C-alpha cells in the first residue's frame, strides 16, 4: 500500500465515539474520544493527522462521514484526496477495544484509556512495531 | 541533540492556553488549543504524544509545570524521565505565533488557526522540512 493512505473511521463504546486512523500500510494508529460524531470533529481531526503526517488520500468504511461542505473544506486545505483502490467488501477497532478493556480499570476516563490503548498497540513487537514501521516506510519514501 | 528528547510548553493567545511540543532534534512540532493550563492536561497530552512518537526525555522553561501528581503518573506509566542537559538560559513559540497570525482569519476558532499554522510549520522548506527530518532521524536512530 502507498505510504500517504490513511483510513478514519468511528466507533462506540460506553455511550462515547471514539475516532480511530489506520495508516493502512504499516498498521500505526492514532485514535481520540470526539464528543460528538460530526463533520466539525471529523474536520478538526484531520487537519491536526495531516500536520503530523504526509497525508495524500483518506478512506473510510462510513462514505457519508465525509460529505459536510466543513470536512469538504479541510480536506482541500490540507490536500487530501478521497481514496478510490481499496474496494469495500463486507478489524483492528475490535483489536484496540480488546487493549482499552485490558487497561479499562488503570485509568477513570475512556479516554485516557484510549491512549493508553494507542500506546500499547504503536509499541508491541509484531519484527518491528507499528511506529518504527511508518516513520521507516515514510522516511524511505522521501528517498 | 538526541532524537528522543521533547520540550514543552504552554503560551497564551486571545484568553486561551496554547500547549506546544518540540521535537528538539528537528524543530518538528505539536501543539493544541487546551482549556486549562493544569496538570491533568499536560498529563493527558504528554501520554498522546508518547504513543505517537518515541519520547525518553521531557524538558521545559517552567519547571513547575511538572510537580503534579497527575503528570508524575503519566510520565511514570509512559517511561518517560525528565531531561538534564539542556541549562536554562534567560523561540519557536514566537515564531508560531507568527504563523498563526497570518492564517488567523481564515478560521473561525483560534485552536483550528493552531493546526493550520502547525501544519505551514513541519511542511515548510527550510533542504528538508521539519516533518521530514524528525521521520529521518527517528527511523536512522533505529537502525
Ligand atoms: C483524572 C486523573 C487523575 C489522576 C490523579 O491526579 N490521581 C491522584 C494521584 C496521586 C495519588 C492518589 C490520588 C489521586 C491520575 C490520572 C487521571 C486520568 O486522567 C487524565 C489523563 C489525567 C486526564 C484518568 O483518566 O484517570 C492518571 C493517573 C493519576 C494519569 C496517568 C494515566 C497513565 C493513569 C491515570
Ligand atoms: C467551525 C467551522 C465551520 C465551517 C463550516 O461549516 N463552514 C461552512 C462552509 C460551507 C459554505 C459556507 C457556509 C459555512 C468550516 C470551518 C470551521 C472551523 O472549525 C472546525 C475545524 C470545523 C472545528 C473554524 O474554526 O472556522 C473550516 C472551513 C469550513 C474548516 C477547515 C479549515 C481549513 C478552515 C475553517
Not at 484531520?46 to 470536512?71: E, I
Not at 479541510?74 to 485490558?102: D, R, T, V
Amino acid at each position: 500500500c502507498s505510504p500517504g493512505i490513511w483510513q478514519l473511521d468511528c466507533t462506540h463504546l460506553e455511550g462515547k465515539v471514539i475516532l480511530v486512523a489506520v495508516h493502512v500500510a504499516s498498521g500505526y494508529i492514532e485514535a481520540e474520544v470526539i464528543p460528538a460524531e460530526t463533520g466539525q470533529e471529523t474536520a478538526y481531526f484531520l487537519l491536526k493527522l495531516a500536520g503530523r503526517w504526509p497525508v495524500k488520500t483518506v478512506h473510510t468504511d462510513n462514505g457519508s462521514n465525509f460529505t459536510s461542505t466543513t470536512v469538504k473544506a479541510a480536506c482541500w486545505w490540507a490536500g487530501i484526496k478521497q481514496e478510490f483502490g481499496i474496494p469495500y467488501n463486507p478489524s483492528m477497532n475490535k483489536e484496540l477495544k480488546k487493549i482499552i478493556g485490558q487497561v479499562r480499570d488503570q485509568a477513570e476516563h475512556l479516554k485516557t484509556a484510549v491512549q493508553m490503548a494507542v500506546f500499547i498497540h504503536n509499541h508491541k513487537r509484531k519484527g518491528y512495531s507499528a511506529g518504527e514501521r511508518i516513520v521507516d516506510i515514510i522516511a524511505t519514501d522521501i528517498q
